[PDB]
Design a protein around this ligand. Structure first.
Ligand code: T6J
Length: 119
């Protein structure tokens, strides 16, 4: 029932994600010199350094907000991919499975702690 525990749990999950070779394309904002049409396709770019910085700045109120930004990294990858077989898209699918597997308990514990707080 610790309402704040999600933050360190998210920091540790982001550390695991940065160690994972599948996060390489997503560790920093997309470079427009490499992908000049990126903003024609993607409304809201997102990457793991921006997620980490937002968390460390105290700019996420809940793990649901962090989850929404991480899911945006994966939906941007799916929207930009030229094919379902691309290297970077295949990396985002594995990384998404890894993220969803680990964020589930974080979200559950936070929501349970908040329901207890407001009982
Ligand atoms: C900096 S990035 O994340 O590699 C930009 C991007 N996102 C993609 C998704 C699929 C294929 C190529 C893609 N290039």
């Amino acid at each position: 029932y610790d309402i704040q525990a999600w933050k360190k749990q998210c920091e540790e999950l982001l550390n695991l994600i940065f160690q994972c070779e599948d996060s390489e394309p997503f560790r920093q904002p997309v470079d427009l010199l490499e992908y000049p049409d990126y903003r024609d396709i993607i409304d809201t770019p997102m990457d793991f350094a921006t997620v980490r910085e937002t968390l460390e700045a105290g700019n996420y109120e809940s793990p649901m907000e962090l989850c929404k930004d991480v899911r945006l990294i994966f939906s941007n990858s799916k929207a930009y991919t030229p094919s379902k077989r691309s290297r970077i898209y295949s990396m985002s699918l594995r990384l998404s499975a890894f993220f969803e597997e680990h964020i589930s308990s974080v979200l559950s514990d936070y929501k349970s702690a908040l329901r207890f707080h407001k009982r």
